[PDB]
Tab-separated table of C-alpha atoms in Angstrom:
chain	number	residue	atom	x	y	z
A	1	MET	CA	-5.800	-98.802	-201.177
A	2	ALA	CA	-4.048	-97.384	-204.295
A	3	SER	CA	-7.484	-96.035	-205.332
A	4	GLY	CA	-10.043	-93.299	-204.572
A	5	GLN	CA	-11.049	-93.583	-200.869
A	6	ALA	CA	-14.738	-94.070	-201.805
A	7	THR	CA	-16.653	-92.063	-199.164
A	8	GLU	CA	-20.466	-92.024	-199.335
A	9	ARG	CA	-21.784	-89.322	-197.001
A	10	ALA	CA	-25.406	-89.893	-195.940
A	11	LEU	CA	-28.218	-88.888	-193.560
A	12	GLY	CA	-31.209	-90.659	-191.970
A	13	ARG	CA	-33.311	-91.445	-188.886
A	14	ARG	CA	-32.365	-93.451	-185.750
A	15	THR	CA	-34.091	-93.562	-182.328
A	16	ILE	CA	-32.188	-92.644	-179.096
A	17	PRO	CA	-33.344	-92.396	-175.310
A	18	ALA	CA	-34.119	-88.650	-175.946
A	19	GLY	CA	-36.344	-89.395	-178.994
A	20	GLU	CA	-36.201	-90.264	-182.737
A	21	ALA	CA	-32.861	-88.539	-183.524
A	22	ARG	CA	-31.314	-87.550	-186.871
A	23	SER	CA	-28.246	-89.599	-187.993
A	24	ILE	CA	-25.123	-88.977	-190.125
A	25	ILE	CA	-23.788	-92.095	-192.000
A	26	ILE	CA	-20.210	-92.485	-193.295
A	27	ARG	CA	-19.923	-95.438	-195.727
A	28	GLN	CA	-16.205	-95.582	-196.775
A	29	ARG	CA	-14.763	-98.392	-198.956
A	30	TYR	CA	-11.479	-99.954	-197.774
A	31	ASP	CA	-9.513	-102.497	-199.878
A	32	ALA	CA	-9.041	-104.866	-196.849
A	33	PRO	CA	-11.318	-107.685	-195.304
A	34	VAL	CA	-13.986	-107.160	-192.558
A	35	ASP	CA	-11.709	-109.311	-190.283
A	36	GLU	CA	-9.024	-106.521	-190.561
A	37	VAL	CA	-11.483	-103.641	-189.961
A	38	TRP	CA	-13.409	-105.454	-187.160
A	39	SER	CA	-10.161	-105.945	-185.215
A	40	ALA	CA	-9.669	-102.126	-185.457
A	41	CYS	CA	-13.341	-101.458	-184.442
A	42	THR	CA	-13.688	-103.668	-181.277
A	43	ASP	CA	-10.141	-104.284	-179.813
A	44	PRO	CA	-9.011	-101.208	-177.572
A	45	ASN	CA	-5.305	-101.832	-178.526
A	46	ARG	CA	-6.411	-101.287	-182.179
A	47	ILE	CA	-8.976	-98.458	-181.412
A	48	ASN	CA	-6.421	-95.963	-179.911
A	49	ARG	CA	-4.370	-96.292	-183.188
A	50	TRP	CA	-6.999	-94.207	-185.090
A	51	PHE	CA	-9.311	-92.940	-182.301
A	52	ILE	CA	-9.334	-93.081	-178.415
A	53	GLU	CA	-8.287	-95.673	-175.769
A	54	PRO	CA	-11.769	-96.879	-174.402
A	55	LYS	CA	-11.919	-97.601	-170.603
A	56	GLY	CA	-14.806	-99.618	-169.097
A	57	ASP	CA	-16.797	-102.845	-169.547
A	58	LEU	CA	-16.567	-102.483	-173.398
A	59	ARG	CA	-19.393	-105.115	-173.512
A	60	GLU	CA	-23.179	-104.922	-174.130
A	61	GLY	CA	-25.069	-104.325	-170.844
A	62	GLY	CA	-21.993	-102.372	-169.573
A	63	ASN	CA	-20.369	-98.875	-169.893
A	64	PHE	CA	-17.353	-97.226	-171.595
A	65	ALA	CA	-15.415	-93.956	-171.062
A	66	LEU	CA	-13.253	-92.349	-173.801
A	67	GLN	CA	-10.632	-90.173	-171.994
A	68	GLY	CA	-11.074	-86.521	-172.921
A	69	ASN	CA	-14.137	-86.984	-175.177
A	70	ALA	CA	-17.364	-88.841	-174.183
A	71	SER	CA	-18.897	-91.524	-171.959
A	72	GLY	CA	-21.781	-93.950	-172.581
A	73	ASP	CA	-22.824	-97.617	-172.673
A	74	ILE	CA	-22.688	-100.527	-175.160
A	75	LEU	CA	-26.191	-101.361	-176.433
A	76	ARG	CA	-25.248	-104.184	-178.863
A	77	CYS	CA	-22.137	-106.017	-180.114
A	78	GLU	CA	-22.534	-108.637	-182.874
A	79	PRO	CA	-19.405	-110.157	-184.645
A	80	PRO	CA	-18.623	-109.469	-187.472
A	81	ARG	CA	-21.870	-107.537	-188.275
A	82	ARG	CA	-22.075	-104.398	-186.020
A	83	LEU	CA	-21.191	-103.066	-182.552
A	84	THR	CA	-23.562	-100.359	-181.202
A	85	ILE	CA	-22.864	-97.828	-178.401
A	86	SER	CA	-24.786	-94.865	-176.909
A	87	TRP	CA	-22.614	-91.702	-176.809
A	88	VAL	CA	-23.006	-88.937	-174.183
A	89	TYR	CA	-20.729	-86.048	-175.283
A	90	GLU	CA	-20.262	-83.318	-172.607
A	91	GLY	CA	-22.511	-80.239	-173.079
A	92	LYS	CA	-24.201	-81.968	-176.078
A	93	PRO	CA	-27.261	-84.422	-175.839
A	94	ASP	CA	-27.034	-88.257	-175.821
A	95	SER	CA	-26.562	-90.192	-179.118
A	96	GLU	CA	-26.842	-93.733	-180.618
A	97	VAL	CA	-23.688	-94.566	-182.610
A	98	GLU	CA	-22.635	-97.832	-184.294
A	99	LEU	CA	-19.743	-99.129	-186.393
A	100	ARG	CA	-20.975	-101.733	-188.890
A	101	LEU	CA	-19.159	-103.840	-191.538
A	102	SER	CA	-20.365	-105.577	-194.704
A	103	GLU	CA	-17.918	-107.666	-196.793
A	104	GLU	CA	-17.664	-106.728	-200.507
A	105	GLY	CA	-15.251	-108.514	-202.912
A	106	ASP	CA	-11.709	-107.080	-202.718
A	107	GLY	CA	-12.864	-104.798	-199.866
A	108	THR	CA	-15.169	-103.872	-197.003
A	109	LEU	CA	-17.974	-101.346	-196.692
A	110	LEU	CA	-17.403	-99.534	-193.363
A	111	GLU	CA	-20.720	-98.102	-192.099
A	112	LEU	CA	-20.540	-95.596	-189.219
A	113	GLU	CA	-23.750	-93.956	-187.938
A	114	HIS	CA	-24.145	-91.227	-185.248
A	115	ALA	CA	-27.722	-90.286	-184.207
A	116	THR	CA	-28.085	-87.140	-182.067
A	117	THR	CA	-31.028	-84.705	-181.660
A	118	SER	CA	-28.614	-81.718	-182.087
A	119	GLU	CA	-28.181	-80.712	-185.782
A	120	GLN	CA	-25.250	-78.588	-184.423
A	121	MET	CA	-23.635	-81.787	-183.101
A	122	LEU	CA	-24.365	-83.763	-186.360
A	123	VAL	CA	-22.228	-81.305	-188.407
A	124	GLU	CA	-19.310	-81.400	-185.837
A	125	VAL	CA	-19.359	-85.217	-185.340
A	126	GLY	CA	-19.240	-85.765	-189.141
A	127	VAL	CA	-15.953	-83.776	-189.002
A	128	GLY	CA	-14.514	-85.619	-185.932
A	129	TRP	CA	-15.621	-89.036	-187.270
A	130	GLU	CA	-14.113	-88.569	-190.794
A	131	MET	CA	-10.970	-87.422	-188.870
A	132	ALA	CA	-11.058	-90.858	-187.121
A	133	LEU	CA	-11.694	-92.424	-190.639
A	134	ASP	CA	-8.547	-90.524	-191.876
A	135	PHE	CA	-6.323	-92.202	-189.257
A	136	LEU	CA	-8.336	-95.485	-189.694
A	137	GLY	CA	-7.875	-95.213	-193.488
A	138	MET	CA	-4.118	-95.162	-192.806
A	139	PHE	CA	-4.396	-97.841	-190.042
A	140	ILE	CA	-6.318	-100.305	-192.302
A	141	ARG	CA	-4.180	-99.926	-195.480
A	142	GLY	CA	-1.934	-96.918	-196.103
A	143	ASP	CA	0.662	-96.786	-193.273
A	144	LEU	CA	0.273	-96.050	-189.495
A	145	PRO	CA	3.310	-96.845	-187.164
A	146	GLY	CA	1.921	-94.276	-184.676
A	147	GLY	CA	-0.123	-91.125	-185.435
A	148	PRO	CA	2.019	-88.102	-184.177
A	149	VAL	CA	-1.186	-85.970	-184.050
A	150	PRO	CA	-4.119	-87.764	-182.167
A	151	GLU	CA	-6.389	-84.676	-182.316
A	152	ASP	CA	-4.072	-81.733	-183.049
A	153	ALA	CA	-5.762	-80.510	-186.228
A	154	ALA	CA	-8.121	-77.581	-185.384
A	155	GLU	CA	-10.961	-77.920	-182.838
A	156	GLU	CA	-13.822	-75.325	-183.159
A	157	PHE	CA	-11.601	-72.521	-184.580
A	158	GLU	CA	-7.790	-72.814	-184.042
A	159	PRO	CA	-5.680	-70.452	-186.386
A	160	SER	CA	-4.051	-73.007	-188.789
A	161	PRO	CA	-4.584	-72.585	-192.670
A	162	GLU	CA	-4.685	-76.315	-193.711
A	163	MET	CA	-6.576	-77.675	-190.690
A	164	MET	CA	-9.228	-74.890	-190.533
A	165	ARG	CA	-10.234	-75.286	-194.231
A	166	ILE	CA	-10.128	-79.155	-194.006
A	167	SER	CA	-12.408	-79.164	-190.874
A	168	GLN	CA	-14.797	-76.611	-192.507
A	169	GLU	CA	-14.956	-78.613	-195.868
A	170	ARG	CA	-15.871	-81.812	-193.872
A	171	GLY	CA	-18.608	-79.922	-192.011
A	172	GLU	CA	-19.741	-78.000	-195.155
A	173	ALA	CA	-20.809	-81.380	-196.600
A	174	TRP	CA	-22.453	-82.523	-193.314
A	175	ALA	CA	-24.110	-79.070	-192.852
A	176	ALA	CA	-25.925	-79.157	-196.257
A	177	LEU	CA	-26.590	-82.890	-195.615
A	178	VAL	CA	-28.317	-82.545	-192.166
A	179	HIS	CA	-30.400	-79.525	-193.312
A	180	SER	CA	-31.512	-81.868	-196.160
A	181	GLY	CA	-31.951	-84.714	-193.629
A	182	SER	CA	-34.566	-82.590	-191.780
């Protein structure tokens, strides 16, 4: 896309096994078809190219395990509408995440939702998800022969001028947003 990467940051409600959790929503416009984005979303060989190589059943009624991140199960998977997974991140509570696509003219509305009970986690995941949407932005339409940095930006607080401010700025939005989400 030779255009403004149209991100719409949002908040809402979504039930999880723990209870009615709070949810961050990233709706980013990409100037490619659902078909293109849905291949990236569901196929493991496409998922590792912006995110993490998922090991498990990868099917609804079964489990998955992202290596060096989180485990969980697959609740739903519905082509080309939405796939839905529950996300157990270590230390943090369980979550209900989905990646969802709606077609839209000369583009596709990508809709990513993460519902956790931890407002702490909602700020951090909005950072780590838009990081995945950075590499996915490139992987859809921009250029991505192989991301040299998978997650070598700045986790928590790693002394690095560019990466510290960029991770803060992401979470500064999501912080204000989730406090408003209530």
